[PDB]
Amino acid sequence: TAVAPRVDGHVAPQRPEPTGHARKGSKAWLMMTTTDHKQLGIMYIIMSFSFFFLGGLMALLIRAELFTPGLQFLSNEQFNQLFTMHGTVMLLLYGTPIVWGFANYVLPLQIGAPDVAFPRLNAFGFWITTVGGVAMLTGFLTPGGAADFGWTMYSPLSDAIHSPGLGSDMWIVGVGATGIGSVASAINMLTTILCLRAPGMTMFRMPIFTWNIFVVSVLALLIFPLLLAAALGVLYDRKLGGHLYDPANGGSLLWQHLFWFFGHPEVYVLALPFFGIVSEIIPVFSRKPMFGYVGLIFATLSIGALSMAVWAHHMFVTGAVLLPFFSFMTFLISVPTGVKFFNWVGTMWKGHITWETPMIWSVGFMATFLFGGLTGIMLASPPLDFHLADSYFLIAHFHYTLFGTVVFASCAGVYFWFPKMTGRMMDERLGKIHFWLTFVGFHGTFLIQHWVGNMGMPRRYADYLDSDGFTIYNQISTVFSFLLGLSVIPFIWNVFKSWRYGELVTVDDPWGYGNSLEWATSCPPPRHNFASLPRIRSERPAFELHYPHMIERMRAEAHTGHHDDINAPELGTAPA
Amino acid sequence: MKSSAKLMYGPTVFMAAMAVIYIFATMHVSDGGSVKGVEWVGSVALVLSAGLTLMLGVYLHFTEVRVDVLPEDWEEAEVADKAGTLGFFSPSSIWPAAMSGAVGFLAFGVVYFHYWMIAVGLMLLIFTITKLNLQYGVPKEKH
Amino acid sequence: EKKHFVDPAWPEHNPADGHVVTELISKVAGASSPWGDDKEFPVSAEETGYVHPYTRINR
Amino acid sequence: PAPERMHYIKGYVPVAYSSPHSSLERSATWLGMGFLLTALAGVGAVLFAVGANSVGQQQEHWVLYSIIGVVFAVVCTVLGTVLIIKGRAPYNRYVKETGRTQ
Amino acid sequence: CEVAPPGGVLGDFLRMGWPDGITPEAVAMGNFWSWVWVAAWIIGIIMWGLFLTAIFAWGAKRAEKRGEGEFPKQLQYNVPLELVLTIVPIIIVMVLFFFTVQTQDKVTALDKNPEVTVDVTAYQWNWKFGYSEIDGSLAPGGQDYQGSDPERQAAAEASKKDPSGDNPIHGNSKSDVSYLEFNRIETLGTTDEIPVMVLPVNTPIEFNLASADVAHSFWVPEFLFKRDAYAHPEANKSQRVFQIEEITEEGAFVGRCAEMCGTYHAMMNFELRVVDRDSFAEYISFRDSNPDATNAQALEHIGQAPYATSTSPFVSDRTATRDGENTQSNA
Amino acid sequence: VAALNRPNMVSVGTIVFLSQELMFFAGLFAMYFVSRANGLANGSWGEQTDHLNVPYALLITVILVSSSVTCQFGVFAAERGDVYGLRKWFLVTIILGSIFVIGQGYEYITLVGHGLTIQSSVYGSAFFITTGFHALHVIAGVMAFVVVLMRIHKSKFTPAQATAAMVVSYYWHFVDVVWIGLFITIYFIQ
Numbered sequence A: 001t002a003v004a005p006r007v008d009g010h011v012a013p014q015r016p017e018p019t020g021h022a023r024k025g026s027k028a029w030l031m032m033t034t035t036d037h038k039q040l041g042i043m044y045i046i047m048s049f050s051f052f053f054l055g056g057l058m059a060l061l062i063r064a065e066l067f068t069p070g071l072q073f074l075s076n077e078q079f080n081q082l083f084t085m086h087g088t089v090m091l092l093l094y095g096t097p098i099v100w101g102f103a104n105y106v107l108p109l110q111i112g113a114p115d116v117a118f119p120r121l122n123a124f125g126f127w128i129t130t131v132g133g134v135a136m137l138t139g140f141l142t143p144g145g146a147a148d149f150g151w152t153m154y155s156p157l158s159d160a161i162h163s164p165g166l167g168s169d170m171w172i173v174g175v176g177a178t179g180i181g182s183v184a185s186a187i188n189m190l191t192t193i194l195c196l197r198a199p200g201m202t203m204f205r206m207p208i209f210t211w212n213i214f215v216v217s218v219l220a221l222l223i224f225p226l227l228l229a230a231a232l233g234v235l236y237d238r239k240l241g242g243h244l245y246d247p248a249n250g251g252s253l254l255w256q257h258l259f260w261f262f263g264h265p266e267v268y269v270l271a272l273p274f275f276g277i278v279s280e281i282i283p284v285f286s287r288k289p290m291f292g293y294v295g296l297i298f299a300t301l302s303i304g305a306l307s308m309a310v311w312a313h314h315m316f317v318t319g320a321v322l323l324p325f326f327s328f329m330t331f332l333i334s335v336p337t338g339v340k341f342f343n344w345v346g347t348m349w350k351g352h353i354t355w356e357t358p359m360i361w362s363v364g365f366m367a368t369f370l371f372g373g374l375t376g377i378m379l380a381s382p383p384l385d386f387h388l389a390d391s392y393f394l395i396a397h398f399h400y401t402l403f404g405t406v407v408f409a410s411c412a413g414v415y416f417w418f419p420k421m422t423g424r425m426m427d428e429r430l431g432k433i434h435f436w437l438t439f440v441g442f443h444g445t446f447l448i449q450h451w452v453g454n455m456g457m458p459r460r461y462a463d464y465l466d467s468d469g470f471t472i473y474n475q476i477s478t479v480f481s482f483l484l485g486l487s488v489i490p491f492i493w494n495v496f497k498s499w500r501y502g503e504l505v506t507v508d509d510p511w512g513y514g515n516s517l518e519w520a521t522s523c524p525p526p527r528h529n530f531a532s533l534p535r536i537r538s539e540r541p542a543f544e545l546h547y548p549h550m551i552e553r554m555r556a557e558a559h560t561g562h563h564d565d566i567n568a569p570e571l572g573t574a575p576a
Numbered sequence B: 001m002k003s004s005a006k007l008m009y010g011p012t013v014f015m016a017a018m019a020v021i022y023i024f025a026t027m028h029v030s031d032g033g034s035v036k037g038v039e040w041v042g043s044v045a046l047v048l049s050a051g052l053t054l055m056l057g058v059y060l061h062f063t064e065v066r067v068d069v070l071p072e073d074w075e076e077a078e079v080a081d082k083a084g085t086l087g088f089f090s091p092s093s094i095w096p097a098a099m100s101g102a103v104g105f106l107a108f109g110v111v112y113f114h115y116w117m118i119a120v121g122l123m124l125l126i127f128t129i130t131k132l133n134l135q136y137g138v139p140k141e142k143h
Numbered sequence C: 001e002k003k004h005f006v007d008p009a010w011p012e013h014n015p016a017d018g019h020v021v022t023e024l025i026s027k028v029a030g031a032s033s034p035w036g037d038d039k040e041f042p043v044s045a046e047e048t049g050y051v052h053p054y055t056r057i058n059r
Numbered sequence D: 001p002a003p004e005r006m007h008y009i010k011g012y013v014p015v016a017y018s019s020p021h022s023s024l025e026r027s028a029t030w031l032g033m034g035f036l037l038t039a040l041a042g043v044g045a046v047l048f049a050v051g052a053n054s055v056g057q058q059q060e061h062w063v064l065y066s067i068i069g070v071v072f073a074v075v076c077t078v079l080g081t082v083l084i085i086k087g088r089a090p091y092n093r094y095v096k097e098t099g100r101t102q
Numbered sequence E: 001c002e003v004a005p006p007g008g009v010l011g012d013f014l015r016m017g018w019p020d021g022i023t024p025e026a027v028a029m030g031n032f033w034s035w036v037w038v039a040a041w042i043i044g045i046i047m048w049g050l051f052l053t054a055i056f057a058w059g060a061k062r063a064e065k066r067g068e069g070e071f072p073k074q075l076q077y078n079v080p081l082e083l084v085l086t087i088v089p090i091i092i093v094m095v096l097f098f099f100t101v102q103t104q105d106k107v108t109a110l111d112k113n114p115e116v117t118v119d120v121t122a123y124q125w126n127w128k129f130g131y132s133e134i135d136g137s138l139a140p141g142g143q144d145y146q147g148s149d150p151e152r153q154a155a156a157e158a159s160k161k162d163p164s165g166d167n168p169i170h171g172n173s174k175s176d177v178s179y180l181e182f183n184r185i186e187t188l189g190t191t192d193e194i195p196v197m198v199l200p201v202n203t204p205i206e207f208n209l210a211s212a213d214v215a216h217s218f219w220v221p222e223f224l225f226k227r228d229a230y231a232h233p234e235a236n237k238s239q240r241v242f243q244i245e246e247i248t249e250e251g252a253f254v255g256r257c258a259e260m261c262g263t264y265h266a267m268m269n270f271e272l273r274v275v276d277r278d279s280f281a282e283y284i285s286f287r288d289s290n291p292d293a294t295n296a297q298a299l300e301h302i303g304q305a306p307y308a309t310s311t312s313p314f315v316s317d318r319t320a321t322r323d324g325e326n327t328q329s330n331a
Numbered sequence F: 001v002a003a004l005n006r007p008n009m010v011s012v013g014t015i016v017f018l019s020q021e022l023m024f025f026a027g028l029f030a031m032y033f034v035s036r037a038n039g040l041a042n043g044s045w046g047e048q049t050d051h052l053n054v055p056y057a058l059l060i061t062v063i064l065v066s067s068s069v070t071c072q073f074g075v076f077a078a079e080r081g082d083v084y085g086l087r088k089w090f091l092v093t094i095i096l097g098s099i100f101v102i103g104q105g106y107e108y109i110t111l112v113g114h115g116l117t118i119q120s121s122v123y124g125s126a127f128f129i130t131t132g133f134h135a136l137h138v139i140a141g142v143m144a145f146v147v148v149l150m151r152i153h154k155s156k157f158t159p160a161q162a163t164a165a166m167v168v169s170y171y172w173h174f175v176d177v178v179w180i181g182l183f184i185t186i187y188f189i190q
């Protein structure tokens, strides 16, 4: 390794300015026209969370109407529209765009890139995602309302006869446009990984988050065009009077196969990047590496593969699918998703854990997602799903999984990478208030709905009779739901305060023990990310950059075995 | 590129296996709780899902079989080896947002199914796509 | 030689080295610049062509 | 020409899972990984056939399902374990030739 | 599973609110359920305990106090343990799947001998039940009874092709209703009447599902089982039949719709009422004797309550519903 | 050495994109094959396959594959640095693809003119959705060639404009290949 000659009159790069100080009119026209992955990342993130609050509104309304038996303020149509558009907003206008926002801001920094492969295509992906959001939500502006069918849009309930209103077509084209955005972002991320890496960073020196974005990018590439094709088939039936989705054609199970082939890989597309974020966060606040790094790569790759085999476990109660095939392969897709916890526990095993805010959020994620996955494997056996399918047990499952990933772990990412986005720290007092409001609210909302579903309350029920015995549980669940809704008040105020008067970050790595390469540059990064690059010889370059004396330990203790690597002779024929 | 090209062969093998298994199972395996017959949607989707990874994997393999030892894929590369021009990247452009709005017009024209709206939407789209592709080619003004 | 035309704005090239660019392969990491690779920047304000106006607006 | 090994001084220990001799770059490993993953479908088929015959079902065809399951599991296992070991040949001779395990 | 779960409060905790099961298939499913929950709570205990260990033990404060230093041991790999904790999941999953195959094939077989057959017809938004076959040991007159209603059925068969010449769907008319059933004795549920469909105890039953328009779901929580009623079940490749070896206990049990079918999806309910075997024989004889007798008249004719007990109809007033008044007390 | 040769980024992005349209047409192949399965289960699929004209589709296919080799000669000219050759061959490709779409239009007017519409049957629906999405991709390909030609009109022919040509050629090769799949499934497998 060469030693560069020191030179005279050297001065370090000038650091860019933090947020809050920006002068009037600076962002307005820049937002319209920018190609910077950093601004597009921040815009993705803010847009997704805005839609998150907008969908949680509808959720609170649903929970209000279930508080007591009867239709106190909603009708039947409006309740149907409400659960439909809550689910749609939460998956396609929060989860996928926030995946791609975190990816856009962080991934070029991690690989040591200046820019993404196709910057204007990146900007197009963002703007078409926002257009899709508008297209979906404008159905409420018609007198008939939004779409009534759930976000799964079964057939023939979605055909021209059984759903005449135009809100359904608005749902269709908006979901399609969100698919367009998802694929543009995938092309960008994948090509940027393939082409623009810093010298020394091979594929097996990238962080865990980058590998996860790799696999989900190929998943999205694989699945979102199929969604668009099937949705256009539905629109073809409706506007052109086609016959492909008729029940006499077998058009119900046609739609179910096409949809869920798209659909389960989409929930894995949401899960894997936030597994990535947690794999970024925990090694920093443990002062340890990521335990089982290469095997963790193989786990992510196996999830990317197996995701295409397990699609039809959402169809056990149909009397149409091959039960043993998909039950077995569902139990198989659970195993590499289970290796994650063992790696994370190994990372924390006898480490020196500092309980900052993002670490707290990550451990809350693990605590919730463990229960979500336990619930899932019991949904994966048919003899249990025959009772639990389309019950509130299923609602409890998929909330315990999604709220673990796209909410808990996404908030962990916010608290973790707020310095790199702003050059300012967030308020830790409010951070923990937000954490505990969220924790109490979520567990008290959704934990009792397991019993509510097991007792025989189906999903998507506007009203029920008080003789059914559900009322007490719905009441407990609704009170804690309103608590969960209150959890965002300190969060919004913490982002708003800290962006504009928060504690200034003076150093390039405020947490101290940053592993990945984004912590080897300024806070915030310059326009082109890097005013200088270190040497890269590990999956944690910034750590070997900040702690030279540690490399001796970092390299020697890395394996359990007595392999005697230090005693070897000089390998190169010459240093030339 | 070299490492990343090999990875596409894992999913390809697996999905080819699952496609053939799914096909001859769904036509062969009897059951009480399910009907017998080849289930075409999953069949076609699994085979073309293997085809996607086969396409991209064989292309990236066929590419890396004729690329030099770049500093990116070299375990001990020095930073100074990558010095020089890196590439052209657009500093800014209005046309992505214009394309998003054009697509929005088209999509709304479909949901309402006004044919003039579909026409105008396709014109907005093709015009803005052309302007994006012609952004850095517009000749200098001449008298 | 005349057995096929080559554009004026094409760069210097050695036929033993393969094409300047081909479908799978290029000589630059990102995209290729629309101003030509054989051009270098910055130039001088003279050959920029730009004449900066002088304006005075009445008060 | 193909590249020569990297230079390492005495007392230096790298981490290089994508070095030239690293099998993870060799492609036969990755096919063998795919076949190792595929082998579990046969075991699923065996458990299915056995358990469906155990409760008095699939009696017409359970022997064939179980046989195809075991031969699928076995051929996948042997093909994958040899595509792997073939892929790991260069690293084995490298460790035979040089002092590092990394 | 064929093993009874643990007893007492442990069993009540483990099944976590599952019905007890009025049929043998339900008992099997609930047993498998209780046992997998024992396993799941064990796994959750150990993993949550590791997380709480990470909180209360491996903190940095305690390490700094006992003189541990700046950094911990930087161990990145234990390759044997990685293999061990890879395969342990797999070999517990294998036993899970073996018992899954067992319990499933117990539930979903057709190796039974139905003595009553029900044709079920969901529509937007109610049910129509009808007795398709009865066994001569249980039917009127002591002879095997087939409940097909010939002319009302022949109309449905005639619908297969429209005589006006449209016929786009593979040769059939769009509105073909041939696949539906039109039995003689039929219990048509209405907005104001819950369909109380009557079955015997200790008798193999077959259910033959279908829908007239969209996809519905026949869910009975006390069977611990549901299946979807699709229109054109043959074309949709859907197994339309289901069978239970017996219904173990007489009573009155509720059943619901579980596939979102539209606006009034919450108002599709029915009552599976289970009576003594001879009481069912007398019921079906009475309705075979009186084609114009309502279902409530026959329920009264064999001493049962006339109207649904396990649920009730819905108020059907968008205004008055809001104060809690949602039954209409048509009983 | 002058410089190390490395992957063409724009070609990589184009192949990652042409991965998308394969899975786009996968759903349409599903909507075709389930419909075919049910229609042959009735024994009534062949009551609309007789509307087809396999010779006309075959000459159509000849025109499209000819255009596909035309744009390859154009890409050869582009990589040589030859702009006039690229103009020539891309124009002939535009012409042959235009002939393709207008012949497909004639076949559509023929099949509609003697009965087969979208609503006439499930067959007509599957036929028109599949062949219609493909025709729209062909029209987009002709648009792309046109945009390339005005690009090499307005700006100077550098290596950048050459890569811009190469990837439109990628796209047209893919469209042609999808027509091979459509042709065998629609007119021969039927």
Ligand code: HAS
Pocket (backbone or CB within 6 Å): A087, A152, A267, A268, A270, A271, A313, A314, A315, A330, A331, A333, A334, A335, A337, A338, A339, A341, A342, A369, A370, A372, A373, A374, A376, A377, A379, A380, A381, A385, A388, A389, A390, A394, A397, A398, A401, A402, A405, E036, E039, E040, E043, E088, E089, E090, E092, E093, E096
């Ligand atoms: C982020 C979003 C989601 C994730 C992640 C997720 C994870 C799983 N899900 Fe799911 N889910 C189902 C099964 C699973 C399984 C097996 C997993 C796996 O990821 C879970 C494994 C994950 C773990 C993290 C495992 C724990 C870790 C360890 C280390 C365990 C050690 C023990 C072992 C290995 C042995 C297991 C044995 C024990 C006794 C514990 C099934 C069927 O098996 C259905 C359809 C059924 C129906 O229609 O009702 C379903 C339905 C849904 C829906 C549809 C809702 C709708 O219709 O709108 C959504 C949105 C959703 C989200 C998500 N789900 N899920």
Ligand code: HAS
Pocket (backbone or CB within 6 Å): A050, A052, A053, A054, A055, A056, A057, A059, A060, A062, A063, A083, A084, A086, A087, A088, A090, A091, A094, A095, A149, A150, A151, A152, A395, A399, A402, A403, A406, A407, A445, A459, A460, A461, A481, A484, A485, A486, A488
């Ligand atoms: C990412 C995925 C998901 C998340 C997160 C999520 C969150 C919640 N869910 Fe959920 N959900 C339910 C309850 C909740 C509640 C109470 C929350 C909570 O997290 C929501 C509270 C969150 C809030 C966030 C509320 C505060 C509101 C604010 C703060 C508004 C102000 C806005 C702004 C923008 C202020 C600032 C202004 C500026 C200008 C800056 C229930 C039942 O209680 C059902 C079953 C429905 C049924 O009938 O079966 C359900 C159904 C679903 C379905 C299936 C939909 C279907 O059946 O078709 C999906 C996929 C799903 C996903 C997700 N859900 N959920």
Ligand SMILES: [Ca+2]
Pocket (backbone or CB within 6 Å): A064, A065, A066, A067, A068, A069, A070, A071, A072
């Ligand atoms: Ca209420």
Ligand SMILES: [Cu+2]
Pocket (backbone or CB within 6 Å): A263, A264, A267, A311, A313, A314
């Ligand atoms: Cu799933």
Ligand SMILES: [Mn+2]
Pocket (backbone or CB within 6 Å): A390, E259
């Ligand atoms: Mn369902």
